[PDB]
Design a protein around this motif. Sequence first.
Motif, PDB file in Angstrom:
ATOM      1  N   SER A   1       5.216   9.413   4.608  1.00 13.83           N
ATOM      2  CA  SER A   1       4.399   9.526   3.366  1.00 13.83           C
ATOM      3  C   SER A   1       3.977   8.142   2.884  1.00 13.83           C
ATOM      4  O   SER A   1       4.580   7.585   1.962  1.00 13.83           O
ATOM      5  N   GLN A   2       2.938   7.596   3.510  1.00  9.42           N
ATOM      6  CA  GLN A   2       2.437   6.275   3.152  1.00  9.42           C
ATOM      7  C   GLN A   2       1.024   6.309   2.566  1.00  9.42           C
ATOM      8  O   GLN A   2       0.063   6.676   3.247  1.00  9.42           O
ATOM      9  N   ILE A   3       0.910   5.938   1.292  1.00  9.71           N
ATOM     10  CA  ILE A   3      -0.382   5.894   0.610  1.00  9.71           C
ATOM     11  C   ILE A   3      -0.829   4.431   0.612  1.00  9.71           C
ATOM     12  O   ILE A   3      -0.001   3.527   0.496  1.00  9.71           O
ATOM     13  N   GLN A   4      -2.133   4.203   0.758  1.00  8.19           N
ATOM     14  CA  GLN A   4      -2.673   2.845   0.795  1.00  8.19           C
ATOM     15  C   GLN A   4      -3.282   2.349  -0.511  1.00  8.19           C
ATOM     16  O   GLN A   4      -3.869   3.109  -1.281  1.00  8.19           O
ATOM     17  N   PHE A   5      -3.125   1.050  -0.735  1.00  6.71           N
ATOM     18  CA  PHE A   5      -3.654   0.360  -1.900  1.00  6.71           C
ATOM     19  C   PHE A   5      -4.344  -0.884  -1.358  1.00  6.71           C
ATOM     20  O   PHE A   5      -3.926  -2.009  -1.623  1.00  6.71           O
ATOM     21  N   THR A   6      -5.399  -0.655  -0.583  1.00  3.16           N
ATOM     22  CA  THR A   6      -6.174  -1.719   0.052  1.00  3.16           C
ATOM     23  C   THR A   6      -6.500  -2.865  -0.899  1.00  3.16           C
ATOM     24  O   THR A   6      -6.833  -3.970  -0.467  1.00  3.16           O
ATOM     25  N   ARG A   7      -6.387  -2.599  -2.192  1.00  2.00           N
ATOM     26  CA  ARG A   7      -6.684  -3.581  -3.215  1.00  2.00           C
ATOM     27  C   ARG A   7      -5.425  -4.247  -3.797  1.00  2.00           C
ATOM     28  O   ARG A   7      -5.523  -5.244  -4.524  1.00  2.00           O
ATOM     29  N   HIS A   8      -4.251  -3.702  -3.481  1.00  2.00           N
ATOM     30  CA  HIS A   8      -2.999  -4.254  -4.000  1.00  2.00           C
ATOM     31  C   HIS A   8      -2.756  -5.704  -3.600  1.00  2.00           C
ATOM     32  O   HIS A   8      -2.525  -6.554  -4.454  1.00  2.00           O
ATOM     33  N   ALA A   9      -2.784  -5.965  -2.295  1.00  2.00           N
ATOM     34  CA  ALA A   9      -2.593  -7.308  -1.768  1.00  2.00           C
ATOM     35  C   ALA A   9      -3.444  -8.332  -2.505  1.00  2.00           C
ATOM     36  O   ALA A   9      -2.933  -9.360  -2.952  1.00  2.00           O
ATOM     37  N   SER A  10      -4.739  -8.066  -2.646  1.00  3.73           N
ATOM     38  CA  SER A  10      -5.588  -9.045  -3.320  1.00  3.73           C
ATOM     39  C   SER A  10      -5.346  -9.085  -4.835  1.00  3.73           C
ATOM     40  O   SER A  10      -5.547 -10.114  -5.470  1.00  3.73           O
ATOM     41  N   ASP A  11      -4.909  -7.970  -5.414  1.00  4.40           N
ATOM     42  CA  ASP A  11      -4.589  -7.932  -6.846  1.00  4.40           C
ATOM     43  C   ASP A  11      -3.394  -8.875  -7.045  1.00  4.40           C
ATOM     44  O   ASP A  11      -3.366  -9.707  -7.955  1.00  4.40           O
ATOM     45  N   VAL A  12      -2.399  -8.724  -6.178  1.00  3.20           N
ATOM     46  CA  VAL A  12      -1.189  -9.533  -6.235  1.00  3.20           C
ATOM     47  C   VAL A  12      -1.528 -11.021  -6.171  1.00  3.20           C
ATOM     48  O   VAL A  12      -1.007 -11.809  -6.971  1.00  3.20           O
ATOM     49  N   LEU A  13      -2.406 -11.400  -5.236  1.00  4.72           N
ATOM     50  CA  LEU A  13      -2.798 -12.804  -5.067  1.00  4.72           C
ATOM     51  C   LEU A  13      -3.481 -13.335  -6.329  1.00  4.72           C
ATOM     52  O   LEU A  13      -3.156 -14.421  -6.815  1.00  4.72           O
ATOM     53  N   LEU A  14      -4.430 -12.563  -6.847  1.00  2.06           N
ATOM     54  CA  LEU A  14      -5.148 -12.934  -8.065  1.00  2.06           C
ATOM     55  C   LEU A  14      -4.175 -13.248  -9.208  1.00  2.06           C
ATOM     56  O   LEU A  14      -4.368 -14.201  -9.961  1.00  2.06           O
ATOM     57  N   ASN A  15      -3.130 -12.439  -9.332  1.00  2.00           N
ATOM     58  CA  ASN A  15      -2.164 -12.644 -10.398  1.00  2.00           C
ATOM     59  C   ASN A  15      -1.272 -13.854 -10.126  1.00  2.00           C
ATOM     60  O   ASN A  15      -0.844 -14.561 -11.050  1.00  2.00           O
ATOM     61  N   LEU A  16      -1.002 -14.104  -8.853  1.00  2.00           N
ATOM     62  CA  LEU A  16      -0.212 -15.262  -8.497  1.00  2.00           C
ATOM     63  C   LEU A  16      -1.029 -16.489  -8.903  1.00  2.00           C
ATOM     64  O   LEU A  16      -0.496 -17.433  -9.492  1.00  2.00           O
ATOM     65  N   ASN A  17      -2.331 -16.452  -8.611  1.00  2.00           N
ATOM     66  CA  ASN A  17      -3.212 -17.556  -8.936  1.00  2.00           C
ATOM     67  C   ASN A  17      -3.270 -17.742 -10.441  1.00  2.00           C
ATOM     68  O   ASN A  17      -3.333 -18.856 -10.930  1.00  2.00           O
TER      69      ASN A  17
END
Lengths: 122, 122
Positions: free
Chosen positions: B1-17
Amino acid sequence: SQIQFTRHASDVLLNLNRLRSRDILTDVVIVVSREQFRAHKTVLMACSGLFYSIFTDQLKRNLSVINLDPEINPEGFNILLDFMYTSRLNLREGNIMAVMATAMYLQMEHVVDTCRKFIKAS
Amino acid sequence: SQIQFTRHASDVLLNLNRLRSRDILTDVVIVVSREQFRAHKTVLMACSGLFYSIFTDQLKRNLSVINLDPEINPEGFNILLDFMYTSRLNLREGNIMAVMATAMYLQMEHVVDTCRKFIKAS
């Protein structure tokens, strides 16, 4: 002039999760019902409104241990922690409610919506 | 049961920045020439082999300041640092060779090769 690496963000996240696996530079232990979860404050902050508030708050910014509220269960949080480091949200009929409440508490609205959609479908 | 968040990775980076921008939880200062760049060790490790090494180094792991070798130029590093936190590499004919050198020193193969190729196209 400007080159965009489309896989970069996911590679970074992938690497951050490997750091977690090997417990490299983890700087906080999240405790839920006494179950311990080691993590990096910055990833926690990057994914949750609650952790963003907790760690931006000077008084708590340097705590190495953070206890979540008693109503928060271990597994629900674990599903979310994994989602944070991998973008994968393992929703099941058996944990769906726990994940939604944990997501709400963590102030992770996008995830909260996904849980609603999951419940409303099958 | 794996749902994708193709936008999560880049959301995470944006917040790190975003955390970089506000200097929240930055835990190291990288010194190039004399210029100072505040950053997160976990981000540097997840992006560069040299930093991976330096931050697991018995001698240097707890240092709050890291001095790059003197042959490295600031702008080249500033560019790569921005790249690390945004997935965007801002190059110019005048800095691309320094950017390439800096990437080799930081052990960022793909960026190196991307620069190499762009130079050969001139």
